[PDB]
Amino acid sequence: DEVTAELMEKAANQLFTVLGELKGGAMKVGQALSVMEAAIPDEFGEPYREALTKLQKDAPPLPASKVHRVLDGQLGTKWRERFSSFNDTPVASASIGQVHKAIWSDGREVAVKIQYPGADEALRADLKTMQRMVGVLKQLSPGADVQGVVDELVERTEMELDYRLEAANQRAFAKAYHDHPRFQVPHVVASAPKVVIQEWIEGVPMAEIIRHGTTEQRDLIGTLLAELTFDAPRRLGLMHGDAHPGNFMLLPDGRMGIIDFGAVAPMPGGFPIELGMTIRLAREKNYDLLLPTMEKAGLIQRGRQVSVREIDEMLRQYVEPIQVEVFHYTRKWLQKMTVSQIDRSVAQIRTARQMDLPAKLAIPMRVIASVGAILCQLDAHVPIKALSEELIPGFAEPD
Numbered sequence: 001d002e003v004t005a006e007l008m009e010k011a012a013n014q015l016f017t018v019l020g021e022l023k024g025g026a027m028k029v030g031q032a033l034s035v036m037e038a039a040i041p042d043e044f045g046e047p048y049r050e051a052l053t054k055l056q057k058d059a060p061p062l063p064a065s066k067v068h069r070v071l072d073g074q075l076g077t078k079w080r081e082r083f084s085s086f087n088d089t090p091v092a093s094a095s096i097g098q099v100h101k102a103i104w105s106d107g108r109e110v111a112v113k114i115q116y117p118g119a120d121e122a123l124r125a126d127l128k129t130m131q132r133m134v135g136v137l138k139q140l141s142p143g144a145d146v147q148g149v150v151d152e153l154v155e156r157t158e159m160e161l162d163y164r165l166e167a168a169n170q171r172a173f174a175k176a177y178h179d180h181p182r183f184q185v186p187h188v189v190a191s192a193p194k195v196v197i198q199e200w201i202e203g204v205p206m207a208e209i210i211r212h213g214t215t216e217q218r219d220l221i222g223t224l225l226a227e228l229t230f231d232a233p234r235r236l237g238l239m240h241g242d243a244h245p246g247n248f249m250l251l252p253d254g255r256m257g258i259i260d261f262g263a264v265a266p267m268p269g270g271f272p273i274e275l276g277m278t279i280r281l282a283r284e285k286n287y288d289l290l291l292p293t294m295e296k297a298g299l300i301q302r303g304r305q306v307s308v309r310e311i312d313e314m315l316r317q318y319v320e321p322i323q324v325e326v327f328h329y330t331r332k333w334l335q336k337m338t339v340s341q342i343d344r345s346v347a348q349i350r351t352a353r354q355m356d357l358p359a360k361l362a363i364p365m366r367v368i369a370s371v372g373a374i375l376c377q378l379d380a381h382v383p384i385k386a387l388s389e390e391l392i393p394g395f396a397e398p399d
Protein backbone atom coordinates (compact mmCIF):
# COMPACT_ATOMS: atom_id res chain seq x y z
CA ASP A 1 0.00 0.00 0.00
CA GLU A 2 3.07 2.21 0.36
CA VAL A 3 3.35 1.72 -3.39
CA THR A 4 -0.20 2.89 -4.07
CA ALA A 5 0.33 6.24 -2.34
CA GLU A 6 3.38 6.98 -4.49
CA LEU A 7 1.48 5.80 -7.58
CA MET A 8 -1.27 8.28 -6.76
CA GLU A 9 1.32 11.01 -6.26
CA LYS A 10 2.83 10.17 -9.65
CA ALA A 11 -0.61 10.20 -11.30
CA ALA A 12 -1.36 13.59 -9.75
CA ASN A 13 1.94 15.03 -11.00
CA GLN A 14 1.30 13.55 -14.45
CA LEU A 15 -2.12 15.17 -14.54
CA PHE A 16 -0.76 18.54 -13.49
CA THR A 17 1.94 18.25 -16.16
CA VAL A 18 -0.77 17.66 -18.75
CA LEU A 19 -2.67 20.63 -17.30
CA GLY A 20 0.48 22.69 -17.83
CA GLU A 21 0.76 21.50 -21.42
CA LEU A 22 -2.87 22.29 -22.28
CA LYS A 23 -3.42 25.49 -20.30
CA GLY A 24 0.07 26.98 -20.19
CA GLY A 25 2.95 25.71 -22.31
CA ALA A 26 0.88 25.19 -25.48
CA MET A 27 2.91 22.07 -26.28
CA LYS A 28 3.89 18.73 -24.78
CA VAL A 29 6.65 18.79 -22.18
CA GLY A 30 8.97 16.65 -24.32
CA GLN A 31 8.67 18.91 -27.36
CA ALA A 32 9.16 21.93 -25.13
CA LEU A 33 12.22 20.23 -23.66
CA SER A 34 13.72 19.75 -27.13
CA VAL A 35 13.12 23.42 -27.98
CA MET A 36 14.57 24.52 -24.63
CA GLU A 37 17.70 22.44 -25.00
CA ALA A 38 18.25 23.94 -28.44
CA ALA A 39 17.47 27.50 -27.29
CA ILE A 40 19.44 27.51 -24.03
CA PRO A 41 23.28 27.62 -24.18
CA ASP A 42 25.02 24.49 -22.91
CA GLU A 43 27.39 26.85 -21.10
CA PHE A 44 24.64 27.40 -18.53
CA GLY A 45 24.37 23.66 -17.97
CA GLU A 46 27.48 22.94 -15.92
CA PRO A 47 27.12 25.83 -13.43
CA TYR A 48 23.50 24.79 -12.83
CA ARG A 49 24.84 21.32 -12.02
CA GLU A 50 27.55 22.57 -9.65
CA ALA A 51 25.07 24.79 -7.89
CA LEU A 52 22.88 21.69 -7.19
CA THR A 53 25.16 19.05 -5.56
CA LYS A 54 26.34 20.96 -2.52
CA LEU A 55 22.77 20.33 -1.41
CA GLN A 56 23.52 16.70 -2.27
CA LYS A 57 26.68 16.95 -0.19
CA ASP A 58 25.03 16.37 3.20
CA ALA A 59 21.62 14.85 2.45
CA PRO A 60 21.23 13.07 5.77
CA PRO A 61 20.94 15.10 8.96
CA LEU A 62 23.74 17.66 9.04
CA PRO A 63 26.71 16.74 11.22
CA ALA A 64 27.11 19.00 14.26
CA SER A 65 29.95 20.94 12.61
CA LYS A 66 27.88 22.13 9.63
CA VAL A 67 24.95 22.97 11.91
CA HIS A 68 27.27 25.11 14.01
CA ARG A 69 28.61 26.64 10.79
CA VAL A 70 25.15 27.73 9.64
CA LEU A 71 24.56 29.14 13.13
CA ASP A 72 27.89 30.98 12.81
CA GLY A 73 26.72 32.51 9.57
CA GLN A 74 23.31 33.60 10.83
CA LEU A 75 23.74 34.50 14.51
CA GLY A 76 27.51 35.01 14.65
CA THR A 77 30.35 32.86 15.96
CA LYS A 78 29.18 33.63 19.51
CA TRP A 79 25.69 32.21 18.91
CA ARG A 80 26.06 29.83 21.88
CA GLU A 81 25.85 32.80 24.25
CA ARG A 82 22.26 33.33 23.13
CA PHE A 83 21.34 29.83 24.29
CA SER A 84 21.26 28.14 27.67
CA SER A 85 21.83 24.84 25.86
CA PHE A 86 21.65 23.32 22.36
CA ASN A 87 21.00 19.72 21.29
CA ASP A 88 23.28 18.79 18.36
CA THR A 89 20.96 15.94 17.40
CA PRO A 90 18.00 17.17 15.29
CA VAL A 91 14.50 16.22 16.43
CA ALA A 92 12.71 16.75 13.13
CA SER A 93 13.12 17.45 9.43
CA ALA A 94 12.05 20.58 7.56
CA SER A 95 11.48 21.06 3.83
CA ILE A 96 14.99 22.41 3.24
CA GLY A 97 16.47 22.13 6.72
CA GLN A 98 16.30 20.42 10.10
CA VAL A 99 14.92 21.34 13.51
CA HIS A 100 16.77 21.21 16.83
CA LYS A 101 15.41 21.42 20.34
CA ALA A 102 17.26 23.86 22.58
CA ILE A 103 17.00 26.11 25.62
CA TRP A 104 17.14 29.87 25.17
CA SER A 105 19.11 32.16 27.48
CA ASP A 106 15.92 33.14 29.33
CA GLY A 107 15.22 29.48 30.12
CA ARG A 108 12.50 28.91 27.52
CA GLU A 109 12.56 25.74 25.44
CA VAL A 110 12.78 26.53 21.72
CA ALA A 111 12.68 24.96 18.28
CA VAL A 112 15.56 26.09 16.08
CA LYS A 113 15.11 25.58 12.35
CA ILE A 114 18.45 25.36 10.55
CA GLN A 115 18.48 25.66 6.76
CA TYR A 116 20.76 23.33 4.79
CA PRO A 117 23.86 25.31 3.67
CA GLY A 118 23.56 24.34 -0.01
CA ALA A 119 19.83 25.03 -0.29
CA ASP A 120 20.04 28.71 -1.22
CA GLU A 121 22.40 28.29 -4.18
CA ALA A 122 20.56 25.23 -5.48
CA LEU A 123 17.08 26.75 -5.28
CA ARG A 124 18.21 30.02 -6.86
CA ALA A 125 19.96 28.18 -9.70
CA ASP A 126 16.80 26.15 -10.23
CA LEU A 127 14.83 29.41 -10.30
CA LYS A 128 17.21 30.88 -12.89
CA THR A 129 16.84 27.80 -15.11
CA MET A 130 13.06 27.88 -14.90
CA GLN A 131 13.06 31.60 -15.70
CA ARG A 132 15.05 30.89 -18.85
CA MET A 133 12.64 28.10 -19.78
CA VAL A 134 9.68 30.45 -19.30
CA GLY A 135 11.45 32.86 -21.65
CA VAL A 136 11.77 30.09 -24.22
CA LEU A 137 8.05 29.28 -23.97
CA LYS A 138 7.02 32.94 -24.19
CA GLN A 139 9.13 33.61 -27.27
CA LEU A 140 8.92 30.34 -29.19
CA SER A 141 5.81 28.40 -28.15
CA PRO A 142 2.82 29.73 -30.14
CA GLY A 143 -0.16 30.58 -27.95
CA ALA A 144 1.65 29.96 -24.66
CA ASP A 145 0.21 31.52 -21.51
CA VAL A 146 3.03 32.18 -19.03
CA GLN A 147 1.41 35.28 -17.53
CA GLY A 148 2.46 35.71 -13.90
CA VAL A 149 4.50 32.49 -13.79
CA VAL A 150 7.95 34.04 -13.21
CA ASP A 151 6.57 36.18 -10.37
CA GLU A 152 5.06 33.08 -8.77
CA LEU A 153 8.37 31.20 -9.06
CA VAL A 154 10.33 34.07 -7.52
CA GLU A 155 7.82 34.50 -4.69
CA ARG A 156 7.76 30.77 -3.87
CA THR A 157 11.56 30.57 -3.96
CA GLU A 158 11.95 33.58 -1.67
CA MET A 159 9.36 32.23 0.76
CA GLU A 160 11.31 28.97 0.93
CA LEU A 161 14.76 30.54 1.28
CA ASP A 162 14.22 33.58 3.53
CA TYR A 163 12.90 32.37 6.89
CA ARG A 164 12.23 35.95 8.02
CA LEU A 165 9.08 36.18 5.87
CA GLU A 166 7.24 33.28 7.49
CA ALA A 167 8.69 34.54 10.77
CA ALA A 168 6.91 37.89 10.27
CA ASN A 169 3.61 36.16 9.47
CA GLN A 170 4.01 34.06 12.61
CA ARG A 171 4.69 37.19 14.67
CA ALA A 172 1.41 38.70 13.50
CA PHE A 173 -0.47 35.55 14.51
CA ALA A 174 1.41 35.13 17.82
CA LYS A 175 0.42 38.65 18.75
CA ALA A 176 -3.20 38.13 17.70
CA TYR A 177 -3.73 34.83 19.54
CA HIS A 178 -1.73 35.50 22.71
CA ASP A 179 -3.63 34.00 25.67
CA HIS A 180 -6.42 32.79 23.37
CA PRO A 181 -8.63 30.11 24.99
CA ARG A 182 -8.42 27.71 22.04
CA PHE A 183 -5.42 28.53 19.83
CA GLN A 184 -1.76 28.52 20.63
CA VAL A 185 0.83 30.22 18.43
CA PRO A 186 4.45 30.05 19.60
CA HIS A 187 6.26 33.39 19.76
CA VAL A 188 9.18 34.09 17.46
CA VAL A 189 12.32 34.36 19.57
CA ALA A 190 14.77 35.11 16.76
CA SER A 191 14.65 35.30 12.97
CA ALA A 192 17.36 35.19 10.32
CA PRO A 193 17.37 34.23 6.62
CA LYS A 194 18.61 30.68 7.31
CA VAL A 195 17.84 30.23 11.01
CA VAL A 196 14.55 30.75 12.77
CA ILE A 197 13.90 30.22 16.48
CA GLN A 198 10.51 29.94 18.16
CA GLU A 199 8.94 28.80 21.44
CA TRP A 200 8.77 25.03 21.74
CA ILE A 201 5.32 23.48 21.78
CA GLU A 202 4.34 19.85 21.52
CA GLY A 203 1.11 17.92 21.56
CA VAL A 204 -0.48 15.24 19.44
CA PRO A 205 0.22 16.03 15.77
CA MET A 206 -2.94 16.29 13.66
CA ALA A 207 -1.52 13.58 11.37
CA GLU A 208 -1.42 11.23 14.34
CA ILE A 209 -5.03 12.10 15.19
CA ILE A 210 -6.01 11.41 11.57
CA ARG A 211 -4.39 7.97 11.81
CA HIS A 212 -5.29 6.78 15.34
CA GLY A 213 -7.10 9.64 17.09
CA THR A 214 -10.09 9.13 19.37
CA THR A 215 -13.51 10.38 18.25
CA GLU A 216 -13.22 13.28 20.70
CA GLN A 217 -9.71 14.22 19.53
CA ARG A 218 -10.88 14.19 15.92
CA ASP A 219 -13.99 16.26 16.62
CA LEU A 220 -12.07 18.74 18.75
CA ILE A 221 -9.08 19.46 16.51
CA GLY A 222 -11.40 19.49 13.49
CA THR A 223 -13.71 22.02 15.10
CA LEU A 224 -10.69 24.12 16.12
CA LEU A 225 -9.32 24.11 12.56
CA ALA A 226 -12.72 25.11 11.20
CA GLU A 227 -12.92 27.95 13.72
CA LEU A 228 -9.40 29.22 12.98
CA THR A 229 -10.24 29.29 9.29
CA PHE A 230 -12.95 31.94 9.75
CA ASP A 231 -11.68 33.61 12.92
CA ALA A 232 -8.26 34.62 11.59
CA PRO A 233 -9.47 36.92 8.79
CA ARG A 234 -12.01 38.43 11.18
CA ARG A 235 -9.45 38.93 13.94
CA LEU A 236 -6.33 40.18 12.16
CA GLY A 237 -7.37 40.50 8.51
CA LEU A 238 -5.22 37.53 7.56
CA MET A 239 -5.96 33.97 6.56
CA HIS A 240 -3.72 31.17 7.81
CA GLY A 241 -3.78 29.93 4.23
CA ASP A 242 -3.73 26.48 2.65
CA ALA A 243 -3.80 23.96 5.46
CA HIS A 244 -1.77 20.80 5.95
CA PRO A 245 -1.97 18.45 8.97
CA GLY A 246 1.73 19.04 9.62
CA ASN A 247 0.88 22.62 10.57
CA PHE A 248 -1.26 21.70 13.58
CA MET A 249 -1.35 19.80 16.86
CA LEU A 250 -3.65 19.10 19.80
CA LEU A 251 -2.23 20.37 23.09
CA PRO A 252 -2.92 18.77 26.52
CA ASP A 253 -5.25 21.62 27.55
CA GLY A 254 -7.39 21.16 24.44
CA ARG A 255 -6.00 24.08 22.45
CA MET A 256 -4.75 23.69 18.88
CA GLY A 257 -1.10 24.55 18.38
CA ILE A 258 -0.18 26.15 15.05
CA ILE A 259 3.45 26.14 13.88
CA ASP A 260 3.57 26.77 10.12
CA PHE A 261 2.80 30.20 8.67
CA GLY A 262 4.34 30.02 5.21
CA ALA A 263 1.02 30.20 3.37
CA VAL A 264 -0.54 33.16 5.17
CA ALA A 265 -2.76 35.11 2.77
CA PRO A 266 -3.82 38.77 3.10
CA MET A 267 -7.50 39.55 3.66
CA PRO A 268 -7.73 43.19 4.85
CA GLY A 269 -11.50 43.39 4.44
CA GLY A 270 -12.12 40.06 6.16
CA PHE A 271 -14.21 37.36 4.46
CA PRO A 272 -16.29 38.68 1.53
CA ILE A 273 -19.96 38.79 2.57
CA GLU A 274 -20.92 37.40 -0.85
CA LEU A 275 -19.72 33.93 0.16
CA GLY A 276 -21.81 33.49 3.31
CA MET A 277 -24.68 35.19 1.53
CA THR A 278 -24.39 32.79 -1.41
CA ILE A 279 -24.39 29.78 0.89
CA ARG A 280 -27.45 30.99 2.82
CA LEU A 281 -29.39 31.75 -0.37
CA ALA A 282 -28.39 28.39 -1.85
CA ARG A 283 -29.55 26.50 1.23
CA GLU A 284 -32.92 28.23 0.88
CA LYS A 285 -32.90 27.52 -2.87
CA ASN A 286 -33.77 31.17 -3.46
CA TYR A 287 -32.45 31.04 -7.03
CA ASP A 288 -34.14 34.33 -7.92
CA LEU A 289 -31.77 36.13 -5.56
CA LEU A 290 -28.96 33.56 -5.63
CA LEU A 291 -28.10 33.84 -9.33
CA PRO A 292 -27.78 37.66 -9.43
CA THR A 293 -25.79 37.55 -6.18
CA MET A 294 -23.35 34.99 -7.59
CA GLU A 295 -23.07 36.88 -10.88
CA LYS A 296 -22.32 40.17 -9.13
CA ALA A 297 -19.80 38.45 -6.86
CA GLY A 298 -18.15 36.85 -9.89
CA LEU A 299 -18.86 33.31 -8.70
CA ILE A 300 -20.44 32.50 -12.06
CA GLN A 301 -19.71 33.78 -15.56
CA ARG A 302 -21.70 36.87 -16.54
CA GLY A 303 -24.10 36.87 -19.49
CA ARG A 304 -24.51 33.09 -19.65
CA GLN A 305 -27.45 30.70 -19.58
CA VAL A 306 -26.90 28.75 -16.36
CA SER A 307 -28.26 25.44 -15.09
CA VAL A 308 -29.80 25.50 -11.62
CA ARG A 309 -28.84 21.83 -11.25
CA GLU A 310 -25.23 22.74 -11.90
CA ILE A 311 -25.39 25.58 -9.37
CA ASP A 312 -26.72 23.12 -6.77
CA GLU A 313 -23.87 20.75 -7.61
CA MET A 314 -21.41 23.64 -7.39
CA LEU A 315 -22.46 24.72 -3.90
CA ARG A 316 -23.39 21.29 -2.50
CA GLN A 317 -20.14 20.77 -0.55
CA TYR A 318 -20.69 24.07 1.25
CA VAL A 319 -24.45 23.81 1.75
CA GLU A 320 -24.81 20.26 3.09
CA PRO A 321 -22.57 20.75 6.15
CA ILE A 322 -24.55 23.75 7.45
CA GLN A 323 -27.95 22.10 6.90
CA VAL A 324 -27.36 20.25 10.17
CA GLU A 325 -26.42 21.26 13.71
CA VAL A 326 -23.35 19.01 13.81
CA PHE A 327 -21.96 17.76 10.50
CA HIS A 328 -19.93 14.58 10.23
CA TYR A 329 -17.19 15.31 7.71
CA THR A 330 -16.30 11.94 6.19
CA ARG A 331 -14.32 10.62 3.24
CA LYS A 332 -17.51 8.88 2.08
CA TRP A 333 -19.37 12.19 1.90
CA LEU A 334 -16.48 13.92 0.16
CA GLN A 335 -16.46 11.14 -2.42
CA LYS A 336 -20.17 11.73 -2.95
CA MET A 337 -19.33 15.39 -3.57
CA THR A 338 -17.18 14.43 -6.57
CA VAL A 339 -20.02 12.54 -8.24
CA SER A 340 -21.25 14.83 -11.01
CA GLN A 341 -24.90 15.62 -11.25
CA ILE A 342 -24.95 16.14 -15.04
CA ASP A 343 -23.75 13.40 -17.38
CA ARG A 344 -22.21 14.90 -20.49
CA SER A 345 -24.11 12.37 -22.60
CA VAL A 346 -27.37 13.83 -21.29
CA ALA A 347 -26.50 17.48 -21.93
CA GLN A 348 -23.45 19.28 -23.33
CA ILE A 349 -23.19 22.57 -21.45
CA ARG A 350 -20.31 24.90 -20.65
CA THR A 351 -19.88 25.13 -16.90
CA ALA A 352 -21.30 28.14 -15.07
CA ARG A 353 -18.26 27.94 -12.79
CA GLN A 354 -15.98 30.96 -12.82
CA MET A 355 -12.59 29.68 -13.96
CA ASP A 356 -11.13 33.12 -13.30
CA LEU A 357 -12.30 33.85 -9.76
CA PRO A 358 -11.66 37.28 -8.25
CA ALA A 359 -8.69 37.08 -5.85
CA LYS A 360 -10.79 38.08 -2.84
CA LEU A 361 -12.95 35.01 -3.49
CA ALA A 362 -10.33 32.67 -4.94
CA ILE A 363 -8.02 32.70 -1.91
CA PRO A 364 -10.58 31.90 0.83
CA MET A 365 -12.35 29.28 -1.30
CA ARG A 366 -9.07 27.48 -1.94
CA VAL A 367 -8.20 27.46 1.75
CA ILE A 368 -11.72 26.29 2.65
CA ALA A 369 -11.39 23.40 0.19
CA SER A 370 -8.12 22.29 1.77
CA VAL A 371 -9.59 22.55 5.29
CA GLY A 372 -12.73 20.63 4.32
CA ALA A 373 -10.63 17.82 2.89
CA ILE A 374 -8.66 17.72 6.15
CA LEU A 375 -11.90 17.58 8.18
CA CYS A 376 -12.93 14.59 6.08
CA GLN A 377 -9.62 12.87 6.79
CA LEU A 378 -10.17 13.57 10.47
CA ASP A 379 -13.66 12.04 10.27
CA ALA A 380 -14.60 15.02 12.45
CA HIS A 381 -18.00 16.01 13.81
CA VAL A 382 -18.08 19.79 13.55
CA PRO A 383 -20.76 22.34 14.48
CA ILE A 384 -19.99 24.27 11.29
CA LYS A 385 -23.49 25.78 11.20
CA ALA A 386 -22.99 27.73 14.44
CA LEU A 387 -19.40 28.67 13.56
CA SER A 388 -20.65 30.02 10.24
CA GLU A 389 -23.48 31.95 11.88
CA GLU A 390 -21.11 33.64 14.32
CA LEU A 391 -18.01 34.14 12.16
CA ILE A 392 -18.97 34.23 8.48
CA PRO A 393 -20.39 37.58 7.24
CA GLY A 394 -23.76 37.32 5.52
CA PHE A 395 -24.50 33.72 6.47
CA ALA A 396 -26.67 34.22 9.57
CA GLU A 397 -30.38 34.81 9.07
CA PRO A 398 -30.47 38.55 8.26
CA ASP A 399 -34.02 38.81 9.61
Ligand SMILES: Nc1ncnc2c1ncn2[C@@H]1O[C@H](COP(=O)(O)OP(=O)(O)O)[C@@H](O)[C@H]1O
Pocket residue numbers: 092093094095096099111113186198199200201202246259260262
Ligand atom coordinates in the same frame (compact mmCIF):
# COMPACT_ATOMS: atom_id res chain seq x y z
N1 LIG B 1 7.52 25.61 17.63
C1 LIG B 1 7.80 24.30 17.45
N2 LIG B 1 7.77 23.44 18.49
C2 LIG B 1 8.05 22.13 18.34
N3 LIG B 1 8.37 21.57 17.16
C3 LIG B 1 8.43 22.32 16.03
C4 LIG B 1 8.14 23.76 16.12
N4 LIG B 1 8.27 24.25 14.87
C5 LIG B 1 8.61 23.21 14.06
N5 LIG B 1 8.71 22.06 14.75
C6 LIG B 1 9.05 20.73 14.19
O1 LIG B 1 9.68 20.89 12.92
C7 LIG B 1 9.01 20.12 11.92
C8 LIG B 1 8.94 20.88 10.61
O2 LIG B 1 8.76 22.28 10.86
P1 LIG B 1 8.05 23.18 9.73
O3 LIG B 1 7.68 24.52 10.32
O4 LIG B 1 7.01 22.32 9.05
O5 LIG B 1 9.26 23.40 8.70
P2 LIG B 1 8.99 23.53 7.11
O6 LIG B 1 7.69 24.30 7.03
O7 LIG B 1 10.20 24.29 6.61
O8 LIG B 1 8.89 22.11 6.63
C9 LIG B 1 7.62 19.84 12.46
O9 LIG B 1 7.20 18.51 12.12
C10 LIG B 1 7.75 19.97 13.96
O10 LIG B 1 7.85 18.66 14.54
